[PDB]
Amino acid sequence: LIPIVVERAYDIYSRLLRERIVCVMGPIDDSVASLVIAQLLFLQSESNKKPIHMYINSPGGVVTAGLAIYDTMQYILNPICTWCVGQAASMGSLLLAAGTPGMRHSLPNSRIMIHQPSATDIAIQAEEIMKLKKQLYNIYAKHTKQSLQVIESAMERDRYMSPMEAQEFGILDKVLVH
Amino acid sequence: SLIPIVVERAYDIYSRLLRERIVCVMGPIDDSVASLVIAQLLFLQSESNKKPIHMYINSPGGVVTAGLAIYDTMQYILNPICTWCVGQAASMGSLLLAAGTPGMRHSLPNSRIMIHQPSATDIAIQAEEIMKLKKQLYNIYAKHTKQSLQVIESAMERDRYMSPMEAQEFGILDKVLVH
Amino acid sequence: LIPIVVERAYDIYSRLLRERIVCVMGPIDDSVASLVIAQLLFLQSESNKKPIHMYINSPGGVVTAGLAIYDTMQYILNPICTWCVGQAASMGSLLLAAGTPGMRHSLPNSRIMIHQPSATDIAIQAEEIMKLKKQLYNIYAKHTKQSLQVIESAMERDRYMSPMEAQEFGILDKVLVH
Amino acid sequence: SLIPIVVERAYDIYSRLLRERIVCVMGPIDDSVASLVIAQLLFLQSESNKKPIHMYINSPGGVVTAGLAIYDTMQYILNPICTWCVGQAASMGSLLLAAGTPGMRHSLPNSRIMIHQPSATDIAIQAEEIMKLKKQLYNIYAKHTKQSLQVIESAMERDRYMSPMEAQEFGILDKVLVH
Amino acid sequence: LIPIVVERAYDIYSRLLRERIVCVMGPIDDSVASLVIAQLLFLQSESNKKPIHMYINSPGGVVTAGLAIYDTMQYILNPICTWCVGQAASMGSLLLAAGTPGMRHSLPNSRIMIHQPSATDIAIQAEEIMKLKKQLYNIYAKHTKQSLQVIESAMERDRYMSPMEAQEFGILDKVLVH
Amino acid sequence: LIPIVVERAYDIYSRLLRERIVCVMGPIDDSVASLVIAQLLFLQSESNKKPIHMYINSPGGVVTAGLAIYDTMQYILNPICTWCVGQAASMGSLLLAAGTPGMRHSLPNSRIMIHQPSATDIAIQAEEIMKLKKQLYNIYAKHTKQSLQVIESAMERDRYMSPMEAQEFGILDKVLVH
Amino acid sequence: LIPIVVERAYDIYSRLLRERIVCVMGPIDDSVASLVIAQLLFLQSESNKKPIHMYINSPGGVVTAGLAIYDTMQYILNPICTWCVGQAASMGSLLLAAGTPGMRHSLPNSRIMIHQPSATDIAIQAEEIMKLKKQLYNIYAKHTKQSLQVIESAMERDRYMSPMEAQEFGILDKVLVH
Ligand SMILES: O=C1c2cc(Cc3cc(F)cc(F)c3)nn2CC[C@H](CO)N1Cc1ccc(C(F)(F)F)cc1
Ligand SMILES: O=C1c2cc(Cc3cc(F)cc(F)c3)nn2CC[C@H](CO)N1Cc1ccc(C(F)(F)F)cc1
Ligand SMILES: O=C1c2cc(Cc3cc(F)cc(F)c3)nn2CC[C@H](CO)N1Cc1ccc(C(F)(F)F)cc1
Ligand SMILES: O=C1c2cc(Cc3cc(F)cc(F)c3)nn2CC[C@H](CO)N1Cc1ccc(C(F)(F)F)cc1
Ligand SMILES: O=C1c2cc(Cc3cc(F)cc(F)c3)nn2CC[C@H](CO)N1Cc1ccc(C(F)(F)F)cc1
Ligand SMILES: O=C1c2cc(Cc3cc(F)cc(F)c3)nn2CC[C@H](CO)N1Cc1ccc(C(F)(F)F)cc1
Ligand SMILES: O=C1c2cc(Cc3cc(F)cc(F)c3)nn2CC[C@H](CO)N1Cc1ccc(C(F)(F)F)cc1
């Protein structure tokens, strides 16, 4: 399934990590967050000044898993370029929006969604789900430079944004074709 | 699902983290998780009983006896242990979190911490036995938070999470850092 | 899953067997018994006087599988230190109590149970399960130095013991913290 | 279920046991178990047809034709075969145990031995064929225990286990040891 | 699961193939036929006069898969010793009967059946299953040197033969003990 | 499962591919077609003049997957010897018939069927299954040198032919025993 | 001279033997070896898994007598803790070094010597003494895990070791004060 490339031989995913690329593809859960966090801490130890590239094609996932990734992103010193490929929905678009200012990108045909689905590691109470939702509000507000009221009304609409809308909204900075 | 290789020598990224003296406690805790964690704690202590060990916890909880096995191994070894709450630490997970070396218990800004126990069991047990275990949790939590038993029991009765700052004031951890 | 540690590279469990540590963790069946016995015979061949450390965190298992380990423990010449970590229930607590006198240990928060559950490789008769139950009576009587009547009454009470009660009952010798 | 490595040369512990000329018959006996066991028997004979082979049996039984394949290979090779009952030997397991070289059949003290056959089969077969197989077991059991057919048939009718000393007196094994 | 032996290291089955041994154990299907055919052609390329040993413990299987092995046996130049261990039923006993004259063997306690069970890769018509049954008749007649009528009567009886019965019938040549 | 042969070591299937043998065993689907096409292109890259041996034991499979092999067989320049071992039914019999003229073979007891079963990756319309069926008619007509009417009447019969029938029909050129 | 302690009354040395303590104090000759061996066989018969404690304060003695004790120590199944109190010189330090690995001890102010004095029941020839010395070199090599050359050079030096020197050399495992 997974091919080998190139003195030294790597599986193609290990070779992408040698380029300082971290993939966040597919639904986000604790093991994805564990793998993502492991690579971020590793790449920073190799160099805390060289940029990291986080390529995101994700429909969303566990909220606490996503915030762990978000928090690790804020922790390391490295500039992080985020790229939306295919889509970034729910927790995925939160990670996309959290890359280094000026370094958040999308491919031309991507779809971006900040609406949250209607998940949880264990079952939780209504006060807890609202507390988490407020955390998403503040993080999105921080990185889009929109106000809380703008973020809450926008997240109430069950819809995807085009890459240019997300650019205008503050989720990303540039839409590139090459 | 594929674990990447990093480099003279090549390691999988998780083996590379263990060489950094990092132990991951991610996901639910059961016996095989406890076995894997204990092996690493004893190994890391055998490399050096003076160097700190960093335990990164992202766990919803798990088997109480398995969590207690990790707790005892933590207390047994001589090493300072820095615990870090990443994502969440609930039930047995926040017990391990609170059991790190005083002054070295941390959280990232957006974590959630829960000491309420869920309503699991290796074998089916009697009511006196589950109460015996629940009292062991009370005393361990009181020991490391320096709270009183009555405060611990009232707190664990509330089905809820705390922020990193509440958990710091409660005595579960010492520092909430952002960088 | 299982990490590698290092001139020589080991999976961490193979490195523990290099310390002469044998884990008996999880339920005991023939497959567990085969692996434990394989390691005990191997560790004896490396040195038949050097102590072996058996780390037990088990809820119990097949009686004949547990007796196979018990007999292999009695057979080899090595002193065996037993450790109860987490718990030792049913056949697990029998192996715990069967370590070398003076070398049976528990960590402080362990739970120990000698009550048997209400399994079997093949279905057996009532006379056969009683024969097995009496063998368990004899082994516990032998190693705890309690009488048949005391063991029979104790295994009838469906409960766990603390490390200190198990010490005073004769199941182990010391409860250690460091 | 992780198999450890032991050490100039490295083996998984089961390959190390096979280098010691030990063959495990642990768990239920089916065709693939028989193929694996037969392969090691022929290999061990090819390494040396004079050196004993150690067959350690902890089995509840299995497919009769598969067990007979092992039985025949035991009879075919020239090596003395020391058999050990560990845990239990029931049905075909007790047939192989009883088929070791005379004077070299052993049990550990707390083992159980059963020659009763259960009430399995590769394909469905007719009543005459099952009766033909059961008679082969009678003749094989009579040969190695030196008991008579009538004694074997009565004993196999009782749904029960024997202790190692009972099986010693019956002729299933020669020595019951502890050290 | 599969042990390693011995300069050079082998899994025990690869070592058996180095001894020019091919195992036919368990039910016969297309993948078994592919594996057995691969080894037969390989062993021939190493030496087309050197004998090959085929060890059969099989309850039967797909007729066309069995015919594929049978034809490869007839095709290669090597003498083939067949050995019945445990049993040879249906297609398994056809492979046993198809070894080199004088080199077809059984161990003393084997069971041999030439009756076919009441299988198919795809569902087939009544005239086609009758064509397959006749091919089996002709092959058995060829190698046992019995007549069509006797083979048809024998395969109507749902029963097994002893090693000596199969010898006198022409399925094999010698019943060996050592 | 798959043995190793030996100096260099190969799994027995990799050793056959070194001999320029391609196995088409079992049902044909996209995964098989990808594997067969990869081997065909590789073998041509080693030599576009050296013959390739395609050994077929197949009950049929996905039509488009079979056509992908058919076209790749036609594309490469190498002589292709096809061998029917066990059986070739539906798309398998189409591949057998598509080998290089004069180099299509069968073992003596094989069964060949050109009737199609009553498949497709996704659900399709009646005009589409008829277009595929017409493609099968034309390919079969081309390589057997039979007329469309002979092919269509023949494929209407749910039946197998013997290797000699298949030879007389134009599916293969030679039926050999050694 | 020998006090009585207490119901049962014992002389204090019989009371130490009830604790499974065996004293090896003073010079070693055949009668000492006979007494020590008698006690070892007795303690094993009471429990062959319970440890035995051997307290050594001896300047040495007859080589064959010391070897007799050594052989009995190796023979019994019991773990043996050896303790050096005061001194262990020549065969005494041989017995000290021959305890169960991990259970060889000294009190803080003891002196240990492996140099042999310039020891025989009857007068013997040179080759014989050489053979005995070689047996001694091999026993020390076995239990200290040093090489023959290191042991022979070490035994040439007319000197005593401190408890920590003897620990680093492999003669003992732990130096205890409380
Ligand atoms: O970066 C850290 C670190 C993370 C955290 C807490 C934290 C955890 C988290 F899950 C997310 C967070 F945001 C922050 N604290 N530290 C301080 C000390 C450690 C180890 O010394 N390093 C350095 C390091 C790590 C891994 C590697 C390599 F190569 F093995 F991968 C090499 C070097
Ligand atoms: O530390 C111990 C030990 C602790 C305990 C009791 C205990 C058990 C437990 F399960 C949890 C506990 F908290 C405490 N018993 N031992 C005896 C075994 C050895 C040797 O003395 N070590 C040291 C050691 C271990 C492993 C490795 C390496 F590298 F192989 F991994 C290297 C050195
Ligand atoms: O120890 C034994 C032994 C066990 C038993 C019977 C028994 C079996 C059992 F399953 C449980 C039991 F309690 C007792 N009998 N023997 C006598 C001869 C054998 C082999 O010669 N060895 C020696 C040996 C050394 C090294 C290694 C290796 F491969 F692991 F390195 C393996 C084995
Ligand atoms: O012993 C035999 C043999 C026995 C039988 C009959 C038989 C079959 C059976 F299934 C069970 C039986 F009891 C008896 N047939 N052969 C022919 C194959 C060869 C050549 O003579 N050997 C010797 C040999 C084998 C294996 C290995 C190694 F190392 F590869 F494993 C090395 C040497
Ligand atoms: O033997 C044959 C062969 C079989 C058939 C047809 C056939 C196919 C079948 F499925 C069953 C059959 F009975 C007959 N035709 N040939 C002629 C040319 C080929 C390849 O050139 N070889 C040679 C060869 C094979 C394998 C190996 C090695 F080592 F890789 F295994 C090395 C050399
Ligand atoms: O042959 C091709 C080729 C054929 C087709 C069209 C086609 C595709 C198809 F799926 C089926 C068909 F019938 C035809 N396209 N290409 C792409 C171009 C490349 C080199 O540029 N090669 C050569 C080559 C192949 C494989 C290897 C190896 F083995 F190493 F991988 C090495 C060299
Ligand atoms: O231990 C042995 C023994 C030693 C030796 C040879 C040997 C002799 C030696 F001097 C040093 C050695 F290392 C080995 N062989 N045996 C086998 C059988 C005997 C008696 O049957 N016992 C058992 C026994 C002893 C003493 C008592 C008690 F208490 F009465 F004194 C009770 C039971």
Closest approach of D50 to chain C, Cα-based (Å): 23
- Are F117 and E121 within 8 A, CB to CB? no
> In terms of C-beta density within 10 A (0-12 exposed, 13-18 middle, 19 or more buried), how is residue C159 classed?
middle
Q: Is the CB of B43 under 6 A from ligand 2?
A: yes
Compute how many other C-beta atoms are within 10 angstroms of the C-beta atom of residue D30.
16
Q: Is the CB of G48 under 6 A from ligand 7?
A: no
State the sign of the Cα–Cα–Cα–Cα dihedral D59, D64, D69, D71: positive
Q: Are D73 and D36 in contact (CB under 8 A)?
A: no
Nearest C-alpha to atom 28 of ligand 7 is from which residue? G42
Closest approach of D1 to chain C, Cα-based (Å): 9
> In terms of C-beta density within 10 A (0-12 exposed, 13-18 middle, 19 or more buried), how is residue G97 classed?
buried
Secondary structure class of E163 (helix, strand, coil): helix
Which residues of chain E are within 8 Å of residue F158 when distances are taken between CB atoms?
125
Residues 6+ apart with CB under 8 A from D19: D11, E5
- Are C74 and G102 within 8 A, CB to CB? no
The separation between CA C178 and the C-alpha centre of its own chain, rounded to angstroms, equals: 21
Instruction: Please state the three-class secondary structure of B120-164 as a single string.
Output: CCCCCCCHHHHHHHHHHHHHHHHHHHCCCHHHHHHHHHCCCCECH
Q: Is the CB of A75 under 6 A from ligand 1?
A: yes
Q: Which residues pair with F25 in a beta bridge?
A: F57
Only one residue has tokens 């086609």, namely E128
Tell me which residue in A14, A124, A132 faces B4 most closely, judged by beta carbons.
A14
Mutate to test the interface with C, among D14, D26, D116 (most CBs of C within 10 A): D26
Q: What is the DSSP string of C30-51?
A: HHHHHHHHHHHHHHHHH-SSS-
A14 CA to middle of ligand 6, Å? 27
Nearest C-alpha to atom 5 of ligand 4 is from which residue? E83
- Resolution, Å (one decimal): 2.7
Helix (H) or strand (E) run with residue E23 in it: strand E21-25
Closest approach of E174 to chain F, Cα-based (Å): 27
> Which of G53, G58, G90, G106 does the annotation list as catalytic?
G90
Which residues of chain C are within 8 Å of residue D161 when distances are taken between CB atoms?
124, 128, 131
C121/D60 Cα distance (integer angstroms):
7
Nearest C-alpha to atom 20 of ligand 6 is from which residue? F45
Query: What Å distances lie between residue F80 and C161, F91, F104, CA to CA?
Result: 76, 17, 8
- Are C49 and G77 within 8 A, CB to CB? no
- Are B161 and A11 within 8 A, CB to CB? no
- List residues of B whose CB lies inside 8 A of any A CB: 2-6, 13-14, 16-17, 20, 24, 26-27, 56, 58, 60-61, 86-88, 90, 108-112, 118, 159-161, 177-179
D178 CA to middle of ligand 7, Å? 16
With an 8 Å CB cutoff and a minimum of 3 pairs, decide whether chains A and E touch: no
Ligand at minimal distance from the CA of F176 is 5
C vs G, Cβ pairs < 8 A, gives 28
Q: What is the DSSP string of A129-160?
A: HHHHHHHHHHHHHHHH---HHHHHHHHHS---
Mutate to test the interface with C, among D3, D5, D117, D176 (most CBs of C within 10 A): D5
Secondary structure class of C178 (helix, strand, coil): coil
CA angle, C63 then C66 then C70, to 5°: 130
Tell me which residue in C25, C89, C160 faces B35 most closely, judged by beta carbons.
C25
D106/G64 Cα distance (integer angstroms):
37
State the sign of the Cα–Cα–Cα–Cα dihedral B150, B156, B157, B162: positive
Q: Which atom of ligand 3 is nearest to the CA of D13?
A: 30
**Cα-trace Rg, chain D:** 16
Residue C56: closest C-alpha in chain B: B35
F73/F68 Cα distance (integer angstroms):
9
Amino acid at site F107: L
F104-139: burial string, b at 16+ Cβ within 10 Å, e else? bbbbbbbbbbbbbeebeeeeeeeeeeeebeeebeeb
> What six digits make up the tokens of B76?
């047994």
Mutate to test the interface with D, among E12, E35, E106 (most CBs of D within 10 A): E12
Active-site positions of A read 90, 115
Which residues of chain G are within 8 Å of residue C100 when distances are taken between CB atoms?
49-51, 79
- The coordinates were experimentally obtained by X-ray
Query: What Å distances lie between residue B91 and A122, B56, D63, F18, CA to CA?
Result: 11, 15, 48, 58
Q: Is the CB of B112 under 6 A from ligand 1?
A: no
Closest approach of B110 to chain C, Cα-based (Å): 27
Q: What is the DSSP string of chain F?
A: -PPEE----EEHHHHHHHTTEEEEES-B-HHHHHHHHHHHHHHHHH-SSS-EEEEEEE--B-HHHHHHHHHHHHHS-S-EEEEEEEEEETHHHHHHHTSPTT-EEE-TT-EEE-PPP---SS---HHHHHHHHHHHHHHHHHHH---HHHHHHHHTS---B-HHHHHHHTS-SEE---
State the sign of the Cα–Cα–Cα–Cα dihedral B108, B109, B110, B111: positive
Q: Is the CB of B47 under 6 A from ligand 2?
A: no
Tell me which residue in E5, E89, E107 faces D72 most closely, judged by beta carbons.
E107
Q: Is the CB of E7 under 6 A from ligand 4?
A: no
Closest approach of F112 to chain E, Cα-based (Å): 11
> What six digits make up the tokens of B39?
């092996």
B145/B166 Cα distance (integer angstroms):
12
> What six digits make up the tokens of D120?
């399995």
CA angle, C145 then C146 then C149, to 5°: 150
> In terms of C-beta density within 10 A (0-12 exposed, 13-18 middle, 19 or more buried), how is residue F11 classed?
middle
Q: Are F64 and F31 in contact (CB under 8 A)?
A: no
Which residues of chain D are within 8 Å of residue E2 when distances are taken between CB atoms?
36
Q: Is the CB of C132 under 6 A from ligand 2?
A: no
Tell me which residue in B36, B38, B65 faces C87 most closely, judged by beta carbons.
B65
Strand pairing class (F52-58; F80-89): parallel
DSSP H stretches of helix in chain A: 12-18, 30-46, 63-75, 91-97, 126-144, 148-156, 163-169
Residues 6+ apart with CB under 8 A from C31: D1, D26, D27
The separation between CA G175 and the C-alpha centre of its own chain, rounded to angstroms, equals: 16
8-state DSSP, G178: -
With an 8 Å CB cutoff and a minimum of 3 pairs, decide whether chains B and E touch: no
Q: Among C162, A64, C5, which residue's Cα sits nearest to residue B43?
A: C5
End-to-end, the C-alpha distance of chain E in Å comes to: 29
Which residue from E17, E21, E100 has its CB within 8 A of the most atoms of ligand 4, so it is best to mutate? E21
Query: What Å distances lie between residue D80 and A144, B42, B157, D137, E5, CA to CA?
Result: 81, 44, 68, 22, 21
Helix (H) or strand (E) run with residue B15 in it: helix B13-19
G25/G116 Cα distance (integer angstroms):
18
Q: Are A94 and A164 in contact (CB under 8 A)?
A: no
Q: Is the CB of D35 under 6 A from ligand 4?
A: no
Q: Are A104 and A133 in contact (CB under 8 A)?
A: no
With an 8 Å CB cutoff and a minimum of 3 pairs, decide whether chains B and C touch: yes
Query: What Å distances lie between residue B51 and B54, B97, B99, CA to CA?
Result: 10, 19, 17
CA angle, F167 then F172 then F178, to 5°: 90
Query: What Å distances lie between residue G71 and A149, C177, E176, G22, G68, CA to CA?
Result: 88, 38, 50, 16, 5
Secondary structure class of A11 (helix, strand, coil): strand
Strand pairing class (C104-106; C80-89): parallel
Closest approach of C26 to chain B, Cα-based (Å): 7
Domains of chain B: 5-176 (3.90.226.10)
